[PDB]
């Protein structure tokens, strides 16, 4: 969506160049996973409340 | 000859972003893995030593 939105011819230009899309989506799905862990480390210490 | 050279630079340059890529994360992730190291090394000294 960011650079082909809604355009077919785009998006078949884009499938030229493979994984770049697919390694992008990771990367910023594993910053994502780890902002939840990190709050999970500083304040779910106790599992007594 | 020159209709190769048009198409030959297209494929070099593709494939050197990704190579730069792959280091890229690659740097990215040893930052990390030193960080987990120092502290391994650091429990080792306090806690078995």
Excluded: H, W
């Excluded at chain 1, 650079?3 to 989506?25: K, M």
């Excluded at chain 2, 494939?15 to 994360?25: A, D, E, F, G, K």
């Excluded at chain 2, 990215?28 to 391994?40: G, M």
Aim: one cysteine or more.
């Amino acid at each position: 969506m960011y650079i082909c939105g809604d355009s077919t011819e785009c998006s078949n230009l884009l499938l030229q160049y493979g994984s770049f899309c697919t390694q992008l989506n990771r990367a910023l799905t594993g910053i994502a996973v780890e902002q939840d862990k990190n709050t999970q480390e500083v304040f779910a210490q106790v599992k007594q409340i | 000859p020159p209709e190769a050279e048009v198409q030959i630079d297209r494929l070099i340059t593709g494939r050197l972003q990704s190579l730069q890529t792959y280091v890229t994360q690659q740097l990215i992730r040893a930052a990390e893995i030193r960080a987990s190291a120092n502290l391994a090394a650091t429990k080792m000294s306090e806690c078995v030593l």
